[PDB]
């Protein structure tokens, strides 16, 4: 519900003097947003759900190639009409056989032949569509207020601390104004619009593994099929029958079912979890505008922490050009601001490392409290420092 630790994270500084920012959220991704003199926050899309799909086509892999028929016609006696031609009970196809006396016929030459095999379906590689009112989005907003390695990921704690929230967005009401206590509030206006990927892609269903395929690769494929009826067309895939037989029996070999034809075109189409009636979009995106002129700092009237500060371990690399670390405050005094900055060289006057966790501060007055901090240090070597003078501690770091 917050960004820290995720690999799909993006940091943003809306604009210059901007109280709002335009953004893009997607499936498993998160976004951290910074704004002068205001708390940092993380907008993140949690879930995509349909809280009403419809089938479109249905290619089969098949069985019933059991019953046979061979309406025979002697030479010059014309064509052969198999009674199994009145109902789709079977699939018929004509041919001719060299014959004559040898096999009961009076003259010698080509005789008509019209055999038939039966057709019903087994494993239907079903597929459906995704109309662009049942689409609801679930966006979670976090606030980079005081935290600890511990509480940073606990949704509960955070909600309790009024430093988090999880609301939904719908085409009905595409916006929301999430209130965060003394931090004011953030109001998103996400626009359900998405491509994201356009509905243009079909909904491929294969046994258990659902996938998202291109309208055409799908529609324009070679396999028996049926729309919404028990009636099947193009069952011609009941092939490899024409051993070009005798009037007695035309081998109707069931065409070998090779799931390779499908599987092979796996990677192309994106995979997606699908329950009987639902398709969780990950495929999908959402353009939002994080208006936040109502987002406000807190604990700004407090004094600076003036007591020792100890590191609780080597800072860690987030893999995003920022590092994380947790402090401990020897301080007995209450909620005070944490004097931490990033200095290019010991005892420099001006900072150089911007803090993600802006305006940090010991939440409680209960001495030895922990403080989590994420900050982006400058490239190359630098120093993280907390406190000043002879209280001040430090730890070096080198970005690349």
């Amino acid at each position, epitope marked *: 519900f917050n960004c820290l630790g995720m690999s799909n994270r993006d940091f943003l500084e809306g604009v210059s003097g901007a109280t709002w920012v335009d953004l893009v959220l997607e499936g498993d991704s998160c976004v951290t947003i910074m704004s002068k003199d205001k708390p940092t926050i993380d907008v993140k899309m*949690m*879930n995509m*759900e*349909a*809280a*009403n799909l419809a089938e479109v086509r249905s290619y089969c892999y098949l069985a019933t190639v059991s019953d046979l028929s061979t309406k025979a016609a002697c030479p010059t006696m014309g064509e052969a009409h198999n009674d199994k031609r009145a109902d789709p009970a079977f699939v018929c196809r004509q041919g001719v056989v060299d014959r004559g006396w040898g096999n009961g016929c009076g003259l010698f030459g080509k005789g008509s032949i019209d055999t038939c095999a039966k057709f019903a379906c087994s494993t239907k590689a079903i597929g459906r569509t995704i109309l662009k*009112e*049942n*689409i*609801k*989005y*679930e966006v979670a907003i976090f606030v980079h207020g005081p935290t600890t390695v511990e509480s940073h990921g606990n*949704y*509960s704690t955070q*909600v309790g601390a009024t430093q988090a*929230g*999880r*609301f*939904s*967005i*719908t*085409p*009905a*009401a595409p916006s*929301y104004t999430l209130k965060l206590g003394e931090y004011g509030e953030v109001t998103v206006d996400c626009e359900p619009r998405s491509g994201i990927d356009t509905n243009a892609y079909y909904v491929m269903t294969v046994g258990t593994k659902t996938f998202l395929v291109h309208r055409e690769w799908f529609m324009d494929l070679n396999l028996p099929w049926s729309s919404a009826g028990s009636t099947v067309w193009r069952n011609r895939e009941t092939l490899m029958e024409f051993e070009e037989p005798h009037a007695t029996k035309q081998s109707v070999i069931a065409l070998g079912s090779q799931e390779g034809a499908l599987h092979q075109a796996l990677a192309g189409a994106i995979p997606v979890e699908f329950s*009987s*009636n639902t398709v969780k979009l990950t495929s999908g995106h959402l353009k939002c505008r994080v208006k936040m002129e109502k987002l406000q700092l807190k604990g700004t009237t407090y004094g600076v922490c003036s007591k020792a500060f100890k590191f609780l371990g080597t800072p860690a690399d987030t893999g995003h050009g920022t590092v994380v670390l947790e402090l401990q405050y020897t301080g007995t005094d209450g909620p005070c601001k944490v004097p931490i900055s990033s200095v290019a060289s010991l005892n420099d006057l001006t900072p150089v490392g911007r803090l993600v966790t802006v305006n940090p501060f010991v939440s409680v007055a209960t001495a030895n409290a922990k403080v989590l901090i994420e900050l982006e240090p400058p490239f190359g070597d630098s120093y993280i420092v907390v406190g000043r003078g002879e209280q001040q501690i430090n730890h070096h770091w080198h970005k690349s």
Partner: antibody
Amino acid sequence: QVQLVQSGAEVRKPGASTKVSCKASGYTFTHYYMHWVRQAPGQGLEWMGIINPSGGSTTYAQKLQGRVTMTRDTSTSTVYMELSSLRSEDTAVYYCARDWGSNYVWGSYPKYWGQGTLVTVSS
Amino acid sequence: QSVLTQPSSVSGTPGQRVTISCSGSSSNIGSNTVNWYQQLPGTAPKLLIYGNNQRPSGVPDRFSGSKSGTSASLAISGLQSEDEADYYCAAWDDSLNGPVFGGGTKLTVLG
């Protein structure tokens, strides 16, 4: 799978109020409306209202307007129904039911039903 | 008093077809699609039919719904003992601006 677990059976005197809970799981809580429907013993179903867990907006049955209140807690995925000024005629099994998935109040209908909570109003 | 009108009781023998009517008005069934719920004894209702004639997964084809003007109907073929239950029709009502129900039909399966 969608699961809705309601609070236990209750008894109340006429004039009192009752607050029934419905704990949801197995789906994204704030993406689906929640309906309440009640059924007096041996009688038919009566829709009571609907709440949007996103934002908390409600629409109530006209006949209950003024003494029913629906609320939700999004952190605990729980919806509540409170009915006040109870009378004997409010004796019923009270069901919460997740909506099918409408993105609008219009055309919503209950699809996944909780187990029900029997509330008896008696002197 | 319910907004949609159903027979209080329908009965049939195992294997037969039975139907359950549901009569409404232009403001509900006439304009909007009908849903049906099945409520087995001692249990919560479950959705049986939606959108006049659509079945949720798991509901067998011998349950079928239809709508004609301001009335709707549920047909149950191949009646089974386990079908004994209360059945409710439902629809959105434009005039009341909310979902309405029929009074319910108790389906009994005879010997």
